[PDB]
Design an enzyme around this catalytic site. Structure first.
Site, short mmCIF file in Angstrom:
data_model
loop_
_atom_site.label_atom_id
_atom_site.label_comp_id
_atom_site.label_asym_id
_atom_site.label_seq_id
_atom_site.Cartn_x
_atom_site.Cartn_y
_atom_site.Cartn_z
N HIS A 104 -6.41 -0.81 -5.39
CA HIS A 104 -6.25 0.22 -6.46
C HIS A 104 -4.78 0.63 -6.67
N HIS A 105 -3.94 0.22 -5.71
CA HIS A 105 -2.49 0.33 -5.79
C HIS A 105 -1.89 -0.82 -6.59
N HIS A 159 -3.24 2.31 2.16
CA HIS A 159 -4.36 3.20 1.86
C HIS A 159 -4.91 3.83 3.15
N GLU A 181 -3.35 4.52 5.64
CA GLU A 181 -2.28 5.50 5.93
C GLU A 181 -2.51 6.89 5.26
N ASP A 192 -5.33 15.95 31.23
CA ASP A 192 -4.23 15.44 30.43
C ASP A 192 -4.77 14.32 29.57
N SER A 227 5.20 3.46 18.14
CA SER A 227 4.95 4.82 18.62
C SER A 227 3.50 5.23 18.33
N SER A 228 3.05 5.03 17.09
CA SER A 228 1.68 5.35 16.66
C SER A 228 0.56 4.44 17.20
N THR A 272 -16.42 12.75 0.97
CA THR A 272 -15.43 13.83 0.92
C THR A 272 -16.09 15.09 0.32
N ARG A 313 7.72 6.82 -12.83
CA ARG A 313 8.24 7.09 -11.48
C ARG A 313 9.62 6.50 -11.25
N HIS A 339 13.03 10.57 1.37
CA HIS A 339 12.11 11.70 1.24
C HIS A 339 10.69 11.31 1.72
N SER A 372 -11.66 22.39 9.37
CA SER A 372 -12.96 22.70 9.93
C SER A 372 -12.87 23.81 11.00
N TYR A 420 -5.35 8.22 4.51
CA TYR A 420 -6.49 8.82 5.23
C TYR A 420 -6.07 9.27 6.66
N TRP A 429 9.39 3.83 -0.95
CA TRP A 429 8.88 3.77 0.43
C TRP A 429 7.97 2.55 0.64
N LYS A 436 -17.83 17.14 2.87
CA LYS A 436 -16.98 18.01 3.66
C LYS A 436 -16.62 19.28 2.90
C1 HEA Z 1 3.83 14.33 3.24
C2 HEA Z 1 4.30 13.84 2.10
C3 HEA Z 1 5.12 14.58 1.09
C4 HEA Z 1 5.47 15.92 0.95
C5 HEA Z 1 5.09 17.11 1.81
C6 HEA Z 1 6.26 15.96 -0.22
C7 HEA Z 1 6.84 17.17 -0.73
C8 HEA Z 1 7.65 17.29 -1.94
N1 HEA Z 1 7.97 16.26 -2.74
FE1 HEA Z 1 7.48 14.28 -2.53
N2 HEA Z 1 7.01 12.28 -2.30
C9 HEA Z 1 6.25 11.75 -1.30
C10 HEA Z 1 5.69 12.47 -0.18
C11 HEA Z 1 5.75 13.91 -0.01
N3 HEA Z 1 6.47 14.75 -0.78
C12 HEA Z 1 6.09 10.39 -1.44
C13 HEA Z 1 5.34 9.47 -0.54
C14 HEA Z 1 6.76 10.05 -2.63
C15 HEA Z 1 6.87 8.64 -3.24
C16 HEA Z 1 8.17 7.95 -2.82
C17 HEA Z 1 8.44 6.69 -3.67
O1 HEA Z 1 8.26 6.73 -4.94
O2 HEA Z 1 8.85 5.62 -3.12
C18 HEA Z 1 7.30 11.25 -3.12
C19 HEA Z 1 7.96 11.37 -4.41
C20 HEA Z 1 8.44 12.61 -4.97
C21 HEA Z 1 8.95 12.74 -6.27
C22 HEA Z 1 9.08 11.61 -7.27
C23 HEA Z 1 10.44 10.91 -7.29
C24 HEA Z 1 10.49 9.89 -8.42
O3 HEA Z 1 9.44 9.30 -8.72
O4 HEA Z 1 11.58 9.68 -8.97
C25 HEA Z 1 9.27 14.09 -6.45
C26 HEA Z 1 9.92 14.73 -7.62
O5 HEA Z 1 9.63 15.89 -7.90
C27 HEA Z 1 8.90 14.71 -5.26
C28 HEA Z 1 9.16 16.09 -4.94
C29 HEA Z 1 8.65 16.78 -3.76
C30 HEA Z 1 8.82 18.15 -3.56
C31 HEA Z 1 9.57 19.07 -4.48
C32 HEA Z 1 8.20 18.49 -2.38
C33 HEA Z 1 8.16 19.88 -1.83
O6 HEA Z 1 6.87 20.44 -2.17
C34 HEA Z 1 8.54 20.13 -0.36
C35 HEA Z 1 8.59 21.67 0.08
C36 HEA Z 1 8.57 21.52 1.59
C37 HEA Z 1 7.50 21.37 2.38
C38 HEA Z 1 6.12 21.36 1.80
C39 HEA Z 1 7.60 21.00 3.86
C40 HEA Z 1 7.84 21.65 5.18
C41 HEA Z 1 6.87 21.43 6.33
C42 HEA Z 1 7.64 21.55 7.40
C43 HEA Z 1 9.06 21.85 7.09
C44 HEA Z 1 7.25 21.49 8.85
C45 HEA Z 1 7.13 22.97 9.23
C46 HEA Z 1 7.15 22.97 10.71
C47 HEA Z 1 6.12 23.37 11.46
C48 HEA Z 1 4.82 23.91 10.95
C49 HEA Z 1 6.30 23.27 12.94
N4 HEA Z 1 8.45 13.81 -4.36
C1 HEA Z 2 -3.32 12.68 1.80
C2 HEA Z 2 -3.03 11.60 1.11
C3 HEA Z 2 -3.95 11.06 0.03
C4 HEA Z 2 -5.33 11.14 -0.07
C5 HEA Z 2 -6.33 11.87 0.83
C6 HEA Z 2 -5.65 10.42 -1.22
C7 HEA Z 2 -7.01 10.38 -1.70
C8 HEA Z 2 -7.41 9.61 -2.86
N1 HEA Z 2 -6.59 8.93 -3.66
FE1 HEA Z 2 -4.56 8.72 -3.51
N2 HEA Z 2 -2.58 8.47 -3.31
C9 HEA Z 2 -1.81 8.96 -2.30
C10 HEA Z 2 -2.18 9.88 -1.27
C11 HEA Z 2 -3.55 10.27 -1.06
N3 HEA Z 2 -4.55 9.98 -1.86
C12 HEA Z 2 -0.50 8.50 -2.39
C13 HEA Z 2 0.66 8.90 -1.49
C14 HEA Z 2 -0.48 7.63 -3.49
C15 HEA Z 2 0.72 6.86 -4.04
C16 HEA Z 2 1.13 5.65 -3.25
C17 HEA Z 2 2.48 5.26 -3.91
O1 HEA Z 2 2.41 4.44 -4.86
O2 HEA Z 2 3.59 5.69 -3.46
C18 HEA Z 2 -1.79 7.60 -3.95
C19 HEA Z 2 -2.22 6.79 -5.00
C20 HEA Z 2 -3.58 6.59 -5.44
C21 HEA Z 2 -3.95 5.60 -6.40
C22 HEA Z 2 -3.05 4.55 -7.11
C23 HEA Z 2 -2.58 5.11 -8.43
C24 HEA Z 2 -1.43 4.27 -8.98
O3 HEA Z 2 -0.40 4.01 -8.27
O4 HEA Z 2 -1.60 3.84 -10.17
C25 HEA Z 2 -5.31 5.77 -6.52
C26 HEA Z 2 -6.17 4.91 -7.38
O5 HEA Z 2 -7.38 4.82 -7.22
C27 HEA Z 2 -5.65 6.85 -5.68
C28 HEA Z 2 -6.97 7.40 -5.52
C29 HEA Z 2 -7.42 8.33 -4.52
C30 HEA Z 2 -8.76 8.71 -4.40
C31 HEA Z 2 -10.00 8.31 -5.20
C32 HEA Z 2 -8.75 9.50 -3.29
C33 HEA Z 2 -10.00 10.11 -2.72
O6 HEA Z 2 -9.92 9.96 -1.28
C34 HEA Z 2 -10.16 11.58 -3.11
C35 HEA Z 2 -11.61 11.99 -2.81
C36 HEA Z 2 -11.74 13.50 -2.95
C37 HEA Z 2 -12.34 14.16 -3.99
C38 HEA Z 2 -13.01 13.52 -5.16
C39 HEA Z 2 -12.42 15.69 -4.03
C40 HEA Z 2 -13.52 16.35 -3.14
C41 HEA Z 2 -14.90 16.11 -3.72
C42 HEA Z 2 -15.83 16.87 -4.37
C43 HEA Z 2 -15.70 18.35 -4.64
C44 HEA Z 2 -17.16 16.16 -4.74
C45 HEA Z 2 -17.42 15.78 -6.17
C46 HEA Z 2 -16.43 14.79 -6.77
C47 HEA Z 2 -16.86 13.90 -7.68
C48 HEA Z 2 -18.31 13.92 -8.06
C49 HEA Z 2 -15.90 12.93 -8.32
N4 HEA Z 2 -4.58 7.40 -5.09
CU CU Z 3 -4.95 4.10 -1.83
#
Ligand code: HEA
Ligand code: HEA
Ligand code: CU
Ligand code: PEK
Ligand code: PGV
Ligand code: DMU
Ligand code: CUA
Ligand code: MG
Ligand code: NA
Ligand code: ZN
Lengths: 49, 58, 144, 79, 43, 73, 46, 227, 84, 98, 105, 259, 514
Positions: free
Chosen positions: M290-291, M240, M242, M91, M156-157, M316, M438, M61, M255, M244, M126, M319
């Protein structure tokens, strides 16, 4: 000249709302789903030991 | 050695509509066909291999 | 009047509140009486009739502000249709419950729960706020 | 004699969450001391504190593997 | 944005067909798998 | 046959913004007050009151007699 | 050179909406079905 | 343990967990306030026919929206960091207990005086006694003395696991080759539950932790009876 | 630093050739001398079956699964000791 | 110490590379390598926009340091004005390849 | 920036240019309605007279519509402006959008 | 007809054969590691070589033979090569991080010391010092080659480039011989792991860089380069300095400080 | 003809389209896997089997959603289609290498599917942490296939990142400075820099996993002196940045979408937005541990990672506030794209804020490896990145295809999706705070209510996904051809018509220096 919404809007709203309420109430209460609500104010504690 | 670049410039700028990878002549075509055959063949074979690996051999 | 795909690079017409005077007239070709109307427009506008004024307006522009800004009944279709599909989702959940899910664990039977609830209370699960705090140990009942 | 031990006390040398080296160091100290005492004609009892500390801290399987390795001639630390 | 009228209009009926066929293509194969889960889990 | 008064014609959007941002600020203080009473103080006083006359041995004894422990019958 | 314009800058045909429906159905539906069949495949090994 | 429909943290069992509750209330308030302000402003931006589409000057309001969030972060970090250092404070424990992660159960070692160790496995659902908790009960609990500072040392003999007990504010990864330390101090007797918190294979979901907190005198007799 | 030489009036081909043959290659010739002198097979240490060494968690995908890729019989013992 | 035998661009450059090089020598820019310099942009002194067809996209940076660029097609005929700042542009069609 | 009076005078002068062309007429109106204000009667007066000199009745009407639109929910503004413009509307023979039926959806 | 200076490339099969060859090599490795067979792998390696050969051939056709490499195109290739090198720096960075992590906190399994108990490091003053003098000297000869090419001197270009390649080949032969003589192996815990993987990827880069130099050598023999246009040569030179600098960091960290 | 065009492409639009098709197909796969997750958790007990099959599903997933759906759609699809159009370039710099970035993806995906078919699949998370991912706890080919899958997606990336950076630096009109390029182009350039720097570090770490598994190295194995924690540092040093990478191009499209439907010629505070993306890009490289707040790290390290993580809120917040200030005074068009963007702003802010909660290592002790983490990242990913993708898709579909969608259907789609994702993820905050871990196939009985509701929500999203397919079919079925687009003066990508010709900007734009 009246579009799709003028002609069908009220019907799509009314019958969409009615359908959604009915089928969610049915799903929630009639098919054996366990919601596991709080025992608080509902369960009489029974001796276990 | 003598500088023969001018001859190669004339050959590769010939207005014969060939894409650059085939523009050297008949050998480009052969080498292209070997490459693509090995790639397509090898890919089918990797799919056969996945098919095999996807099942237990107890 | 009639707009073509291969005119994309030309100045075009738009009805927009914030761009009141578009780059071209709504209507560029003029009939005989329309040409005479454009001539009459060069004299006093007081001598123009109401109909003629409306016709000059409709040569220049497609919709008035009132027409372009009008509200619609779209919201009813949108909300009603969303409820319909959310409704349809419950059918998928019903199918799933019936055909996919087996019985849930025996620990959800009513008597198991009553016993577990007493044991949670005997162990004072969450005694400050969450759970046991809600049980009157003196009156042997849930706090009213 | 100077004892009355409950558990290994805080040691300012290993103040953090990872205590692996505390176990290890006290294991080496005990066995170093044991070897010094057994050799020069003295008493193992002066080694006791290290023995208590490492026993408290070290997982049984680590101490047990380390002991097997000392007997085998494969223990990588210096005793 | 402005657009021309549909070149090949898709009537309410035709939409009901594309929508049914679309939902079926997602629901039927997964449904089949899920329904036969128990048959899979012990066989 | 009365004329109409010249109304305000400039900075209407800005004026609306100012008014409501100031409103948002007032609501935020009101919510902070509420929250620091219905949530934060409530929590501190629940813990404080619970421990004020808490008797851990009596608590254990009630648990023991109820039969919950492996180590204490 | 290549065909240009709506319906021609794409690797699939939109000439017939029913044939298109079939293709979209196979394409999106194969994607969605695959994990279920993989789960089934795993279940049926051991 | 968690109870049905719980919304927040399990009730605090240690002074440190209580500290995390108050710090979470403080942060949650900030989260609600900011996200409700954003939603409010969105709705404000969207509910007027008045327009102003010409170029807007930015270098003035950017001050406000950088300084205010900066102040807010410092107001979070201050209590955050006070609690972090508290949790790190020298305490002098009375007792050291080791736990070792395994696939799929925990072992415990109390080797301060005698050589006490045993395995601790989930009670299968078919064998629960009436009123026992599915997935949570173990055959042998971690009996510990209440009201005392205990050093817990955590490792693993196979893959990663993680040893957690939410009510005490604890979670320490179990890593082979490594010995992680945490301290535990329960303000109350009772049973406090946790669950393995690092994915470790086929039965990750089924290797829970149960602490039994009792008076020192009962803990000593239990230890002796367990040799 | 500034090295200990000079030129800098214009670094060209002549100068870089000067460096090639006047400094770099003579250095290589000197190190080559030094190496083909301090060489000679040093006497292999006693074998001790340390557990942090000669790791085998999975057989190598060549040979008999138990020899490293550039296995040298003289100096690389197997997990059970030096070869015959 | 020195000799020759390495071709120069003058002797050996070909195709479009050679065209850019010869055009640069005559001070010309048929392949749009350089930024054109603005005239005053009035009705009498319009910016002169070369083209090999009868329209060309202009982007106008109305004031120095604007981050927003204003884009429009410039068509053959009378001068057109930037819709944001009014500066004038005139298409000067044809040629490049003789 | 500048005072309110300087801003208005600048726009009055813009629209009063005797030989203002069609392009400038549009550019002026389309720029003006970007601002956070409903233009003063004097500015509209000059824009309407520019429409007259350009023989463009329909743009005069559209200008009156945009005044209404710029007032948003402040319903008092547009009738005030029409009131103030009345001698000019009568002199030039400009009918309002209401008199033309162009306010009806 | 275009009136910008960039290159529209003819539609090409090499991306696809490139991608398939990556599938065949990764599949092939899996097959080799798990199903005792080398066949997929060999086919992948073959199509990979064929792809690279034809793709780069075509690049030479497009530039030397067809004249698409205007200055704007050359400048693009410059950024491309610099970015590629940066990505290669970060790849090595991960191996150095692994090396410093293990060697700064040697665990009890090692004896709690570095180098581990039972490891006998190579003497850094012997073959590794020689290797250092060889790569450094090759950085000098390749600079002589560049300057000769810019001064239009065909014979000295070829001489200096030949010397550079001989030095690359020398380093490679010395390193092969060190690998064979080393008393420790890749299976000798984290010491052998960090040593062989780091210096092994480095050795791989020396081989790629030498190959790239050899290509330049033949292109020069065939008069492809002008005294001003020779990006293939500059790119190989940049890549060569990169390989030299990675060696210096390996020498200082693993051979010298980690001994 | 067909093969020359679609297998041998050197065209940025055609390659974009291949990416969008690939990404849409991956989306269906990722959706199916997420319904399997939520079907397992939808009632207490065991549905599929034990944690192995379950976590094979969870792992696939994540890999599918991240590497096959989000990155290809945002970067490969929108980046390729729009970036050259937005700078008037004929291009990409490396049009043929661009094609290989695309064609590496199907093999990469085939490797991922292969790993789930052989043996018992890779049930590692993952993050693929050893020793569970090692050759004793996960013997056989599955993890090696997963590693090779990531290698291919990584190559690829990296080549994609080099292509975007070169194109954006080198191929702008000579008069256009970097401060005259649109925000979407900035967002893609910053994304490409993070890719270039972070993917090679992941490549190094997984290669070390590969050698531990097959060549008897012991980078991560205590017995040879290695350390499982070293893998976590290498992985998160990439992971991390990743996240961003996943959100930045979304910020870029938000935007444009917000500026566009607000009737604005430009976003509020352009230079502030460029600064904020750059600051976020830079800060995202110094917060990775922080992970790792529970692995046993020194207290001062934890204090540093808490503080540096929090600072990210400031750029952030600039923005989010600038988006609101772009709406301000707008002539608001309530189009489906705008609804996506407005939902993005709110829901992204929510998920960002719960990330700020998690940044506090003291609290993260209790939240780490619970559903509070899952709720945080699904707000930012399944609402954030996904809403940005849907917004972008509906806004630009008429440019790519020359046809319009039915806006009423698109609004219906938005409404269902919005209810579904909130129903799915909001209750997971309660499950996390109360301690549900989890990667569990089953949970103690107390957690039943929120898991039931959460699974129901996921079924509603399923319905939105199916409706989406029908909606795209209906647009292609009906063939309403685009005529006029507004605001072309500030949206160059539209100015060559819909769809633009195969070759655009053969004669470049004219921009005066002045
Ligand atoms: C981009 C990242 C992403 C997205 C979109 C989602 C979407 C969803 N995920 Fe997530 N999920 C993860 C990334 C994401 N997930 C990751 C990283 C983990 C951690 C894995 C790990 O623990 O190792 C995780 C773990 C995770 C868990 C925890 C499993 C566990 O801890 O045991 C659950 C359970 O509810 C969950 C559910 C869902 C559900 C219900 C959706 C639904 O909301 C999905 C509904 C569908 C859509 C939002 C998508 C469709 C978009 C398209 C189809 C493209 C359309 C095409 C064009 C526009 C051309 N996910
Ligand atoms: C799109 C992907 C995405 C983005 C953008 C972020 C953004 C951020 N994430 Fe997250 N995060 C994940 C995807 C993402 N995360 C995923 C996938 C994991 C799980 C990895 C895994 O274990 O599988 C994870 C896990 C993760 C952890 C580890 C938790 C744990 O495993 O115990 C932490 C800890 O610090 C963290 C923090 C943050 C913070 C501070 C931001 C910040 O960048 C957010 C900043 C934004 C805002 C704050 C809101 C806008 C601001 C305002 C309106 C201004 C005022 C706000 C204040 C004054 C506070 N995230
Ligand atoms: Cu991080
Ligand atoms: C002579 C100097 C030049 C070095 C190159 C030598 C040729 C062999 C081919 C491989 C080249 C690949 C480079 C790095 C790979 C890992 C280890 C190679 C370094 C090396 O050669 O180490 C040898 C170990 O060989 C072994 O296992 C090697 C077994 C060969 C298996 C190759 C494993 C392939 C792994 C593929 C990973 C590729 C992923 C990279 C991704 C890049 C980004 C996508 C050392 O031999 P030893 O007998 O243990 O000790 C010497 C005792 N007398
Ligand atoms: C056993 C040996 C096999 C090992 C596998 C790898 C094998 C060898 C790879 C060696 C690379 C050979 C590259 C040859 C490229 C020749 C094409 C070329 O050099 O093309 C030049 C352009 O540069 C360009 O594309 C620049 C092209 C740059 C290519 C960069 C090469 C690095 C490849 C690295 C791949 C390995 C991955 C690393 C593993 C972790 C053409 O422009 P000029 O030179 O200016 O000529 C024009 C003048 O004549 C005009 O007057
Ligand atoms: C998580 C996403 C999935 C959501 C839930 C799916 C929604 C329901 C779709 C229905 O799919 C079908 O349902 C059947 C029953 O309703 C099946 O018939 C089966 O059961 C029958 C009725 O008992 C028999 O007639 C047949 O032999 C047959 O095998 C079965 O084949 C299947 O295709
Ligand atoms: Cu043990 Cu999870
Ligand atoms: Mg964890
Ligand atoms: Na379950
Ligand atoms: Zn301008």
């Amino acid at each position: 000249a009246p579009d799709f919404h003028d002609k069908y809007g009220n019907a799509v709203l009314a019958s969409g709302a009615t359908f959604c309420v009915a089928v969610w109430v049915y799903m929630a209460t009639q098919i054996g789903i366990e919601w596991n609500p709080s025992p608080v104010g509902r369960v009489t504690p029974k001796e276990w030991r | 050695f003598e500088n023969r670049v001018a001859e190669k410039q004339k050959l590769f700028q010939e207005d014969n509509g060939l894409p650059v990878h085939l523009k050297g002549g008949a050998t480009d075509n052969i080498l292209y066909r070997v490459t693509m055959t090995l790639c397509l063949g090898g890919t089918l074979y990797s799919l056969y291999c996945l098919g095999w690996a996807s099942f237990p051999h107890k | 009047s009639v707009v073509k795909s291969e005119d994309y690079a030309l100045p075009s017409y738009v009805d927009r509140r914030d761009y009141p005077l578009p780059d071209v007239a709504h209507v560029k070709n003029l009939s005989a009486s329309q040409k005479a109307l454009k001539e009459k427009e060069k004299a006093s506008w007081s001598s123009l009739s109401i109909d003629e004024k409306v016709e000059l307006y409709r040569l220049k522009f497609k919709e008035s502000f009132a027409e372009m800004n009008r509200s619609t009944n779209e919201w009813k279709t949108v909300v009603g249709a969303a409820m319909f599909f959310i409704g349809f989702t419950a059918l998928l959940l019903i199918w799933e419950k019936h055909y996919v899910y087996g019985p849930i664990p025996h620990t959800f039977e009513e008597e198991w729960v009553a016993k577990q609830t007493k044991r949670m209370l005997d162990m004072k699960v969450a005694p400050i706020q969450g759970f046991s705090a809600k049980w009157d140990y003196d009156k042997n009942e849930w706090k009213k | 004699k100077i004892k009355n031990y409950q558990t290994a006390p805080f040691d300012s040398r290993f103040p953090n969450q990872n205590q692996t080296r505390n176990c290890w160091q006290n294991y080496l100290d005990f066995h170093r001391c044991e070897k010094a005492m057994t050799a020069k004609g003295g008493d193992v009892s002066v080694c006791e504190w290290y023995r208590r500390v490492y026993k408290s801290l070290c997982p049984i399987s680590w101490v047990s593997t380390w002991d097997d390795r000392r007997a085998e001639g494969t223990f990588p630390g210096k005793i | 944005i402005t657009a021309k009228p549909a070149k090949t209009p898709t009537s309410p009926k035709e939409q009901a067909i594309g929508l049914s066929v679309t939902f079926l293509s997602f629901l039927l194969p997964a449904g089949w798998v899920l329904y036969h889960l128990d048959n899979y889990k012990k066989s | 046959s009365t004329a109409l008064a010249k109304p305000q014609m400039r900075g209407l959007l800005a004026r609306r913004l100012r008014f409501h941002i100031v409103g948002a600020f007032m609501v935020s203080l009101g919510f902070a007050t509420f929250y620091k009473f219905a949530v934060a103080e409530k929590r501190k006083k629940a813990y404080a009151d619970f421990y004020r006359n808490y008797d851990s041995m009596k608590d254990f004894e009630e648990m023991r007699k109820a039969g919950i422990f492996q180590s204490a019958k | 050179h290549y065909e240009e314009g709506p319906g021609k800058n794409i690797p699939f045909s939109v000439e017939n909406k029913w044939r298109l429906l079939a293709m979209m159905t196979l394409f999106f539906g194969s994607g969605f079905a695959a994990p279920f069949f993989i789960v089934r495949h795993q279940l049926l090994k051991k | 343990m968690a109870y049905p429909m719980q919304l927040g943290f399990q009730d605090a069992t240690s002074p440190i967990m209580e500290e995390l509750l108050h710090f979470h209330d403080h942060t949650l308030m900030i989260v609600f306030l900011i996200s409700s302000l954003v939603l409010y402003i969105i709705s404000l931006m969207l509910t007027t026919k008045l327009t102003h589409t010409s170029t807007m000057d930015a270098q003035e309001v950017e001050t406000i929206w950088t300084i205010l969030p900066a102040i807010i972060l410092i107001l979070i970090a201050l209590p955050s960091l006070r609690i972090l250092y508290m949790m790190d404070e020298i305490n002098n424990p009375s007792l050291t207990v080791k736990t070792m992660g395994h696939q799929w159960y925990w072992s415990y070692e109390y080797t301060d005086y005698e050589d006490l160790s045993f395995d601790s496995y989930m009670i299968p659902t078919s064998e629960l006694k009436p009123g026992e908790l599915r997935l949570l009960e173990v055959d042998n609990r971690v009996v510990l003395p209440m009201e005392m500072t205990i050093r817990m040392l955590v490792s693993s003999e196979d893959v990663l696991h993680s040893w957690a007990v939410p009510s005490l504010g604890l979670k320490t990864d179990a890593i082979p080759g490594r010995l992680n330390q945490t301290t535990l101090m329960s303000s109350r007797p009772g049973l406090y539950y946790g669950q393995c918190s690092e994915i470790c294979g086929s039965n990750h979901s089924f290797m829970p932790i149960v602490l039994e907190l009792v008076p020192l005198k009962y803990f000593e007799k239990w230890s002796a009876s367990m040799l | 630093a500034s090295a200990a030489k000079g030129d800098h009036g214009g670094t060209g081909a002549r100068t870089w050739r000067f460096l090639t043959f006047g400094l770099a290659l003579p250095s290589v010739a000197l190190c080559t001398l030094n190496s083909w002198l301090h060489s000679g097979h040093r006497e292999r240490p006693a074998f001790i079956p340390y557990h942090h060494l000669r790791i085998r968690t999975k057989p190598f995908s060549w040979g008999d699964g138990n020899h490293t890729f550039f296995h040298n019989p003289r100096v690389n013992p197997l997990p059970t000791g030096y070869e015959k | 110490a020195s000799g020759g035998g390495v071709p120069t661009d003058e002797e050996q450059a070909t195709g479009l590379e050679r065209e850019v090089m010869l055009a640069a020598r005559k001070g010309q820019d048929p392949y749009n390598i350089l930024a054109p310099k603005a005239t005053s942009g009035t009705k009498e002194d319009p910016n002169l926009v070369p083209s090999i067809t009868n329209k060309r996209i202009v982007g106008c940076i109305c004031e120095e340091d604007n981050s927003t660029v204003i884009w429009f097609w410039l068509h053959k005929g009378e001068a057109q004005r930037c819709p944001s700042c009014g500066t004038h542009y005139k298409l000067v069609p044809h040629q490049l390849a003789h | 920036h500048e005072t309110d009076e300087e801003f208005d005078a600048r726009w009055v002068t813009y629209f009063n240019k005797p030989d203002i062309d069609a392009w400038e007429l549009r550019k002026g109106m389309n720029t003006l309605v970007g601002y956070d204000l409903v233009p003063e009667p004097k500015i509209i007066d000059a824009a309407l007279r520019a429409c007259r000199r350009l023989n463009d009745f329909a743009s005069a009407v559209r200008i009156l519509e945009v005044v209404k639109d710029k007032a948003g929910p402040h319903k008092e503004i547009y009738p005030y402006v029409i009131q103030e413009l009345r001698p000019t509307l009568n002199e030039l023979g400009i009918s309002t959008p209401e008199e033309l039926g162009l306010d009806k959806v | 007809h275009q009136t910008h200076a960039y290159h529209m490339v003819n539609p090409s099969p090499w991306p696809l054969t490139g991608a398939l060859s990556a599938l065949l090599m990764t599949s092939g490795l899996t097959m080799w590691f798990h199903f005792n067979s080398m066949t997929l792998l060999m086919i992948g390696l073959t199509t990979n070589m064929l792809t690279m050969y034809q793709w780069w051939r075509d690049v030479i056709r497009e530039s030397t033979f067809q004249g698409h490499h205007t200055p704007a195109v050359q400048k693009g290739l410059r950024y491309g090569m610099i970015l590629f090198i940066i990505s290669e720096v970060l790849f090595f960075t991960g191996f150095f991080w692994a090396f410093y992590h293990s060697s700064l906190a040697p665990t009890p399994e090692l004896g709690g010391c570095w180098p581990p108990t039972g490891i006998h490091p190579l003497n850094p003053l012997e073959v590794p010092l020689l290797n250092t003098s060889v790569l450094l000297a090759s950085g000098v000869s390749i600079t002589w080659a560049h300057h000769s090419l810019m001064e239009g001197d065909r014979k000295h270009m070829l001489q200096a480039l030949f010397i550079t390649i001989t030095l690359g080949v020398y380093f490679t032969l010395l390193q092969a011989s060190e690998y064979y003589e080393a008393p420790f192996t890749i299976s000798d815990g984290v010491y052998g792991s960090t040593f062989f993987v780091a210096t092994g990827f480095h050795g791989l880069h020396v081989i790629i860089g030498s190959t790239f130099l050899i290509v330049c050598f033949f292109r020069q023999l065939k008069f492809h380069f002008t005294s001003n246009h020779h990006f293939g040569f500059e790119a190989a030179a940049w890549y060569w300095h990169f390989v030299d600098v990675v060696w210096l960091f390996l020498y200082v960290s693993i051979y010298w400080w980690g001994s | 003809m067909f093969i020359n065009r679609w297998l041998f492409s050197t065209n940025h639009k055609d390659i974009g389209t291949l990416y969008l098709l690939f990404g849409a197909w991956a989306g269906m796969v990722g959706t199916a896997l997420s319904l399997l997750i939520r079907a397992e958790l939808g009632q207490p007990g065991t549905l599929l089997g034990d944690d192995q099959i379950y976590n094979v599903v969870v792992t696939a997933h994540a890999f599918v959603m991240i590497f096959f759906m989000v990155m290809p759609i945002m970067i490969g699809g929108f980046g390729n289609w729009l970036v050259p159009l937005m700078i008037g370039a004929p291009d990409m710099a490396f049009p043929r290498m661009n094609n290989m970035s695309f064609w590496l993806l199907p093999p990469s995906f085939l490797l991922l599917l292969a790993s789930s078919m052989v043996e018992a699949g890779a049930g590692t998370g993952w993050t693929v942490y050893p020793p569970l991912a090692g050759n004793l706890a996960h013997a056989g080919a599955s993890v090696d296939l997963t590693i090779f899958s990531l290698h291919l997606a990584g190559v690829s990336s990296i080549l994609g990142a080099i292509n975007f950076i070169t194109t954006i630096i080198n191929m702008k009109p000579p008069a256009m400075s970097q401060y005259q390029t649109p925000l979407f182009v900035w967002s893609v350039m910053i994304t490409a820099v993070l890719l270039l720097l972070s993917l090679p570090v992941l490549a190094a770490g997984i290669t070390m996993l590969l050698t531990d598994r097959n060549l008897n190295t012991t980078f991560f194995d205590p017995a040879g002196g290695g350390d499982p924690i070293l893998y976590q540092h290498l992985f998160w040093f990439f992971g991390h940045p990743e996240v961003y990478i996943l959100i930045l191009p979304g910020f870029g499209m938000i935007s444009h979408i917000v500026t566009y439907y607000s009737g604005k010629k430009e976003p509020f505070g352009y230079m502030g937005m460029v600064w904020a993306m750059m600051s976020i890009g830079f800060l995202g490289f110094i917060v990775w541990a922080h992970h790792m707040f529970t692995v046993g790290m020194d207290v001062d390290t934890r204090a540093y990672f808490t503080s540096a993580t929090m600072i990210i809120a400031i750029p952030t917040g600039v923005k989010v506030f600038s988006w609101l200030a772009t709406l301000h005074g707008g002539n608001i068009k309530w189009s489906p794209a705008m609804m996506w963007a407005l939902g993005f702003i709110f829901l992204f802010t929510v998920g960002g804020l719960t990330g700020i909660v998690l940044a506090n290592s003291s609290l993260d002790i209790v939240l780490h490896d619970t559903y509070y983490v899952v709720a945080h990242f699904h707000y930012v990913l399944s609402m954030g990145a996904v809403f940005a993708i849907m917004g972008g898709f509906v806004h630009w579909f008429p440019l790519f295809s020359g046809y319009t969608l039915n806006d009423t259907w698109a609004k219906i789609h938005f409404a269902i999706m919005f209810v579904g994702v909130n129903m799915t993820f909001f209750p997971q905050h309660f499950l996390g705070l109360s301690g549900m871990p989890r990667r569990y196939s089953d949970y103690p009985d107390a957690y039943t209510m929120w898991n039931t509701i959460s699974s129901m929500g996921s079924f509603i999203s399923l319905t939105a996904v199916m409706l989406m397919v029908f909606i795209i079919w209906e647009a292609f079925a009906s063939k309403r051809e685009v005529l006029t687009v507004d605001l072309t003066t500030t949206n160059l990508e539209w100015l060559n018509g819909c769809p633009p010709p195969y070759h655009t900007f053969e004669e470049p734009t004219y921009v005066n220096l002045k």
